[PDB]
């Protein structure tokens, strides 16, 4: 990167910190978002320089935010949530019945 080139690059790194900070603060706010997942961000770089051997690229730049987990683990436990409803409602039901003629 150039002189101005280095100037924004360090700025962008600071801006990325802000973005990283922004995500974390939200997650801090999400601490009681009782239906929230992990969304996290990525980084990248820009500019060119030359002496043989490889490809070249330099600087700082931000890259998108993503989430992924064992999706079906949610499916796994969701199946359980089903039958807990099945039993708990029945259990309460029988206690009602039992109270009728104690």
């Amino acid at each position: 990167m150039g002189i101005f080139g280095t100037l924004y690059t360090g700025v962008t790194g600071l801006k990325a910190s802000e973005v990283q900070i922004a995500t974390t603060g939200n997650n801090i706010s999400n601490a009681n978002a009782t239906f929230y997942t992990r969304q996290r961000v990525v980084q990248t770089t820009n500019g060119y320089i030359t002496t043989g051997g490889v490809q070249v690229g330099t600087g700082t730049a931000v890259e998108s935010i993503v989430r992924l987990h064992d999706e079906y683990s949610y499916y796994k436990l969701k199946g359980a949530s089903n039958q807990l409803e099945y039993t708990k409602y029945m259990a309460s039901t029988l206690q009602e019945i039992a109270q009728r003629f104690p």
Binding site: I21, A31, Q99
Partner: protein, 50 residues
């Protein structure tokens, strides 16, 4: 019979103060932290303007 429903009726609406009190702590402690976290960001916002 009335006693049965009396308790049952309560139980439907009954709140456990200790459980809720702890849940208050859960949010109450958390809310404190997020408050400072907000402060930290606010300071971070200002200081860099050197």
């Amino acid at each position: 019979l009335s006693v049965n429903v009396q308790s049952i009726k309560s139980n439907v609406i009954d709140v456990d103060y200790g459980e809720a009190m702890m849940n208050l702590m859960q949010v109450q402690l958390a809310y404190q932290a997020s408050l400072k976290a907000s402060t930290t960001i606010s300071q971070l916002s200002l200081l860099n303007y050197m």
